[PDB]
Chains A and B, each alone.
Chain A
Amino acid sequence: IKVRENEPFDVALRRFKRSCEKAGVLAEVRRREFYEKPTTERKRAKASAVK
């Protein structure tokens, strides 16, 4: 989120934003509501993460 970076450099270094928000809870909340269908999405998202 915040980086108050300091002395001798110019590079972005903001690899933090791909550690929480951005397209995390953002591509998410963007569009179709969902409702009971996430349940189905996150149910297939465990059947996968078994092996």
Chain B
Amino acid sequence: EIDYKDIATLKNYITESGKIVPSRITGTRAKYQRQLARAIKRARYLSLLPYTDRH
């Protein structure tokens, strides 16, 4: 959310597969769903999080 390093908070905004969870489920606000995804994206690149559950 407020940051990608927080993989802690994060891991509960992604499905098992690692797909970013729709806001209609997280029930999250708008502005933040973006800050969220952006930080998730950010965290996948630094291998702090999977893209895929195939690993």
Contacts and interface: CB of A to CB of B under 8 A. Distances in A.
Q: Please report whether the interface of chain A is mostly helix, strand, loop or mixed according to DSSP.
A: loop
Interface residues of B, number: 5
Chief secondary structure at chain B's binding surface: loop
Interface stretch (B15-23, B31-39, B41-49): B15-23
A20 B21 CA distance: 11
Interface in A1-51: 1-2, 20-21
Contacts of B17: 1, 20-21
Interface of B: 15-17, 19, 53
Given A2-B16, A20-B15, A20-B19, 6 more contacts: A1-B16, A1-B17, A1-B53, A2-B53, A20-B17, A21-B17
